[PDB]
Design a protein around this ligand. Structure first.
Ligand SMILES: OCCCn1nnc2c(Br)c(Br)c(Br)c(Br)c21
Ligand SMILES: [Cl-]
Length: 325
């Protein structure tokens, strides 16, 4: 299996570009920054609102928890490669604790409004507008030979007042190389593509497009998350109940994918559902023929038949956004 697009991007560039293990970051001093407030925390980091003491600017400091330095080099190099990218969070600095040498990444501040509150009040145009902005970031990183691999609402910062969007947390991102087998333990359960859920390691940029399709569905239909699995097994069941079981098996046959025998107990028999089935009185104003056509071309089992970010950007759904400029 080969990506349709940007497939040989990294092989045509200097080894230096993608060989992140040989990257040597310049680590500044964290003394330049004053921590103000904890914003969040995960497995790999804790994130703080901070002030740059010299220019008085508000920033975000991500303090990295004990992981192998390889993964830190990967994230830092990916961010350097994506610098100036449209709607990619800007890395301002890479600094270390002056006593423990704990590394930290410093990012631009975005006045984010959490998706739970935001997604309930988005208009049809808002959804089109923000999906377009997010697609700009995905086309950009894919064009730079990079898969994000953790596209989800929590990783998309939206300033709804200034209409700014940033794709954040590149800690799971990886360089795409044709025929390389990747770890399927990436992305968050609700946004994992079928390829991950059936342990298919030869995936590519199209993984991110499945995740974006999941977001689009949650926004236009107001079921968030759209596919709400209780575990990784049930996640695929939720998907197959909509996309259909025979279509799943057709996908597995095409790529010679072996299905975990535990799926025999739980997968059942389900016909493909019409997307119009998810329309009701509270989401009618967000759904259009154009929106359903785009969604149908994103949420496909066949990772090679999903729209690329660029093809999705060119879809009629986004015409009102392009006209407004
Ligand atoms: O790149 C790692 C992302 C971690 N992360 N978590 N919460 C964040 C908020 Br709120 C803002 Br605002 C920004 Br800016 C970032 Br960054 C945040
Ligand atoms: Cl990997």
């Amino acid at each position: 299996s080969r990506a349709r697009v940007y497939a040989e991007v990294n092989s045509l560039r200097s080894r230096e570009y993608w060989d992140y293990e040989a990257h040597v970051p310049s680590w500044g001093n964290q003394d330049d920054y004053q921590l103000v407030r904890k914003l969040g925390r995960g497995k790999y980091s804790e994130v703080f609102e901070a002030i740059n003491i010299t220019n008085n600017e508000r920033v975000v400091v991500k303090i990295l928890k004990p992981v192998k330095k390889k993964k830190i080099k990967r994230e830092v190099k990916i961010l350097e490669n994506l610098r100036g990218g449209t709607n990619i969070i800007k890395l301002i600095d890479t600094v270390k604790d002056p006593v423990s040498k704990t590394p930290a990444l410093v990012f631009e501040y975005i006045n984010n409004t959490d998706f739970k509150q935001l997604y309930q009040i988005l208009t049809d145009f808002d959804i089109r507008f923000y999906m377009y902005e997010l697609l700009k970031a995905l086309d950009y990183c894919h064009s730079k030979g990079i898969m994000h691999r953790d596209v989800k609402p929590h990783n998309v910062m939206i300033d709804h007042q200034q209409k700014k969007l940033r794709l954040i947390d590149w800690g799971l991102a990886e360089f795409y190389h044709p025929a390389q087998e990747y770890n399927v333990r990436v992305a968050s359960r609700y946004f994992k593509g079928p390829e991950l859920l059936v342990d298919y390691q030869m995936y590519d940029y199209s993984l991110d497009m499945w995740s974006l399709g999941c977001m689009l569905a949650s926004m236009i239909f107001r079921r968030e998350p759209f596919f709400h699995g209780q575990d990784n097994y049930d996640q695929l069941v939720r998907i197959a109940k909509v996309l259909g079981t025979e279509e799943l098996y057709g996908y597995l046959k095409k790529y010679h994918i072996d299905l975990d025998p535990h799926f025999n107990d739980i997968l059942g028999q389900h016909s493909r559902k019409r997307w119009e089935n998810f329309i009701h009185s509270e989401n009618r104003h967000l759904v259009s023929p154009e929106a359903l056509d785009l969604l149908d071309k994103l949420l496909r089992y066949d990772h090679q038949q999903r729209l690329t970010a660029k093809e999705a950007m060119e879809h009629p759904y986004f015409y009102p956004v392009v006209k407004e400029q």
